[PDB]
Amino acid sequence: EHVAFGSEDIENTLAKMDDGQLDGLAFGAIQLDGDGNILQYNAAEGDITGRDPKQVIGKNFFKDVAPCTDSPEFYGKFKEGVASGNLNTMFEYTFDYQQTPTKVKVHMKKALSGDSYWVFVKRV
Numbered sequence: 001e002h003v004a005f006g007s008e009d010i011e012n013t014l015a016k017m018d019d020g021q022l023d024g025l026a027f028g029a030i031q032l033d034g035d036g037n038i039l040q041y042n043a044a045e046g047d048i049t050g051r052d053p054k055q056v057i058g059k060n061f062f063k064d065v066a067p068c069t070d071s072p073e074f075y076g077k078f079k080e081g082v083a084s085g086n087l088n089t090m091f092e093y094t095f096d097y098q099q100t101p102t103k104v105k106v107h108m109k110k111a112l113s114g115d116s117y118w119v120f121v122k123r124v
């Protein structure tokens with residue numbers, strides 16, 4: 001696919017993509033419901049994090065997959081922006097749960113589809 005991380009209209013462009021098209025992106029992409037359960041998880045993300053994109057669907061991102069993100073600086077921003085319905089935040093973060101610590105840039109943005117929220121990731 002031909003979509004850049006951080007693009008202004010990213011939520012419109014990604015709405016057309018099934019799992020296979022999402023796997024064509026240059027950056028990691030996760031879709032979460034408002035509780036943090038994983039709805040979609042692409043190949044680029046699995047390459048960064050080590051997780052098997054097929055196995056993490058249905059797991060809770062904050063409680064089980066990514067406890068290092070269960071903090072005010074990541075989960076706190078997510079749950080606030082879900083509550084307001086206007087989630088659009090970008091920040092760097094380090095992933096260090098049972099993995100070599102890996103610093104990334106994270107972009108969380110509310111999707112167009114109902115009860116759906118994007119988490120985009122690239123290496124920094």
Ligand SMILES: *C(=O)/C=C/c1ccc(O)cc1
Pocket residue numbers: 030045049051065066067068069094095096097
């Ligand atoms: C900290 O526990 C981060 C874990 C993590 C981040 C992103 C993923 O896609 C998977 C696990």
